[PDB]
């Protein structure tokens, strides 16, 4: 009774693909983001934005295709199809990099949709919404890297382009220009990711190797029942093993699983904060004390100063092709090079 | 020193473009994703055993026989999040997958470094795209190559006397 | 004065002390180089 | 080496303030009636 409740009923019906109110946002945006990417990487060039071939059509492979960022001259234009740049011309829109903002913006709203879905489904089934909470980390990463970062820079041009090799280029740029590996926020990110992968592996292995014998089969998967009340593995034996091997062990399963949420989620959040700084060139580039010493003392050398020489190489060698809007011409004689190479 | 190693390795092996390092990344990104996912799903379905003024962790006692969360609720949520059959209902199968994904990915990472040790390197698409006349049409691979060159020409700036870095 | 019924005891178990101290010390070990610059 | 002359107190307080907070909390938990 009442169109809203009737719509709510239908939206929330238990079907193969749950829809929900969240689905109204999620499905179109996620579909357009994914479809935008497939369309661009298959058919669309980056000749006019980057001087790059970027599609299967031009001869790129899965590793080299991308949907590239718009030209630097576009600034942070939303680049809407009907906007003042493309003026409703679909072909020109593609050539100007309009699919990049298309995918970034639809992708952002799609992510909002997915997290709302996590909330919606949790509420309906009656579980706590920790999965949604955990998803805040992918969201912080996407927003900081694909939105905040280029927004602090000159234009969308310097956002990551959506492609395998293009993303690799983004990594190397961050090394050469930002010294991003030196950043403690990135370091915490690394710790959360590697620590998360570690926890994933060690927990999976531990459960699988402290299983109770609940069947006669040598393949042990059958001997589990979804409705069984009993733990399928021995927490007590697991605890003794790790206490004796490593010195400490989990004793509390709830803490264990919360910690598995905490580690990679916190790591990703920390890396996002660092990238927000990088939006402004607020880098962890240098140690001042190192530079003062090195400048005065030509025999003082550390791995820190060695890496800056690599960075200087990266900037000078990659900049003219990577930043074509700058029209860099670096005569051969000014290029930094060690002996012979 | 680690970062140094990594940057030189990229210059000399184009490791980013190597499928074993790519499997490594899927392994560790995937490991962290599944870590967060599993953690969140079990946490989401903890059976109420405590009041609001205490930590939920006191609802589990070390060595108790019964499971501390409702796996049916957990599965009912995740199955609806994606679709019923993308969700594990067998906890043994789930925990095997948690073990296997990062472990296999990281074995490949290790084999990446261990085979690039014998100079079978990442994919090289340098100048792979050429126009009708023969002009090189750069791709993102060519931009990667410029960054790699910068690393190559600068590293160990006093060590090389001859034109090719052969080890 | 009539007592406040909203008061609660606070707790930190030993494991949480050890986890917390680890966090703080490792963060210090990480950030100290940047503080000295 | 020409280090930041506030690095020492920054690091000391960074360690000591939250460590002390935790020690206070731990010890007063132990002293509670069992």
């Amino acid at each position: 009774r009442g169109w809203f409740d009737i719509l709510d009923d239908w939206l929330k019906r238990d079907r193969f693909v749950f829809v929900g109110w969240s689905g109204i946002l999620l499905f179109p945006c996620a579909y357009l983001a994914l479809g935008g990417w497939l369309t661009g990487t298959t058919f669309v060039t980056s000749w006019y934005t980057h001087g790059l071939a970027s599609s299967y059509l031009e001869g790129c492979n899965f590793l080299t295709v991308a949907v590239s960022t718009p030209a630097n001259s576009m600034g942070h234009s939303l680049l809407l199809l009907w906007g003042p740049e493309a003026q409703g011309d679909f072909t020109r829109w593609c050539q100007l990099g309009g699919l990049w903002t298309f995918i970034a913006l639809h992708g952002a709203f799609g992510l909002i949709g997915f997290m709302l879905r996590q909330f919606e489904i949790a509420r309906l089934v009656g579980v706590r919404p920790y999965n949604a909470i955990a998803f805040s980390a992918p969201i912080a990463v996407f927003v900081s890297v694909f939105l905040i970062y280029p927004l602090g820079q000159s234009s969308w041009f310097f956002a990551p382009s959506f492609g395998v090799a293009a993303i690799f280029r983004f990594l190397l740029f961050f090394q050469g220009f930002h010294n991003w590996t030196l950043n403690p926020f990135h370091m915490m990110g690394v710790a959360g990711v590697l620590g998360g992968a570690l926890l994933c592996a060690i927990h999976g292995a531990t459960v699988e190797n402290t299983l109770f014998q609940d069947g006669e089969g040598a393949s042990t998967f059958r001997a589990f029942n979804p409705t069984q009340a009993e733990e399928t593995y021995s927490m007590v034996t697991a605890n003794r093993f790790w206490s004796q091997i490593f010195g400490i062990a989990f004793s509390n399963k709830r803490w264990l699983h919360f910690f598995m949420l905490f580690v990679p989620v916190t790591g990703l959040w920390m890396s996002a904060i660092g990238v927000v700084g990088l939006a402004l060139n607020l880098r962890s580039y240098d140690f001042i004390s190192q530079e003062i010493r090195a400048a005065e003392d030509p025999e003082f050398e550390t791995f820190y100063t060695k890496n800056l020489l690599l960075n200087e190489g990266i900037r000078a060698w990659m900049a003219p092709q990577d930043q074509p809007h700058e029209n860099f011409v670096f005569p051969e004689e000014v290029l930094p090079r060690g002996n012979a190479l | 020193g680690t970062f140094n190693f990594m940057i030189v390795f990229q210059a000399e092996h184009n490791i980013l473009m190597h499928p074993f390092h790519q499997l490594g990344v899927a392994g560790v990104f995937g490991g962290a994703l599944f870590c967060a996912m599993h953690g969140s799903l079990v946490t989401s379905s903890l059976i109420r055993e405590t009041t609001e003024t205490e930590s939920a962790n006191y609802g589990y006692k070390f060595g108790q026989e019964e499971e501390t969360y409702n796996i049916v609720a957990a599965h009912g949520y995740f199955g609806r999040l994606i679709f019923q059959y993308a969700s594990f209902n067998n906890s043994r199968s789930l925990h095997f997958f948690l073990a296997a994904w990062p472990v296999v990915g990281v074995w490949f990472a290790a084999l990446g470094i261990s085979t690039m040790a014998f100079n079978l390197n990442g994919f090289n698409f340098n100048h792979s795209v050429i126009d009708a006349k023969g002009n090189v049409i750069n791709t993102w691979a060519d931009i990667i190559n410029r960054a790699n060159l910068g690393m190559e020409v600068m590293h160990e700036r006093n060590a090389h006397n001859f034109p090719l870095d052969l080890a | 004065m009539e007592p406040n019924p909203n008061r609660q005891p606070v707790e930190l178990n030993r494991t949480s002390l050890y986890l917390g101290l680890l966090l703080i010390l490792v963060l210090a070990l990480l950030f100290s180089s940047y503080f000295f610059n | 080496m020409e280090v930041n002359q506030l690095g020492l107190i920054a690091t000391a307080l960074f360690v000591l303030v939250p460590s002390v907070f935790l020690i206070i909390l731990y010890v007063q938990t132990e002293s509670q009636q069992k």
Partner: peptide, 30 residues
């Protein structure tokens, strides 16, 4: 002082490992 500071923090971390292992709250089966 920097070096003292780094070594101090490291030393405290090692001391923490010792207490965390040998003076942990023992796990108890109820």
């Amino acid at each position: 002082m920097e070096t003292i500071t780094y070594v101090f923090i490291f030393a405290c971390i090692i001391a923490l490992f010792f207490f965390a292992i040998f003076f942990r709250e023992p796990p108890r089966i109820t």
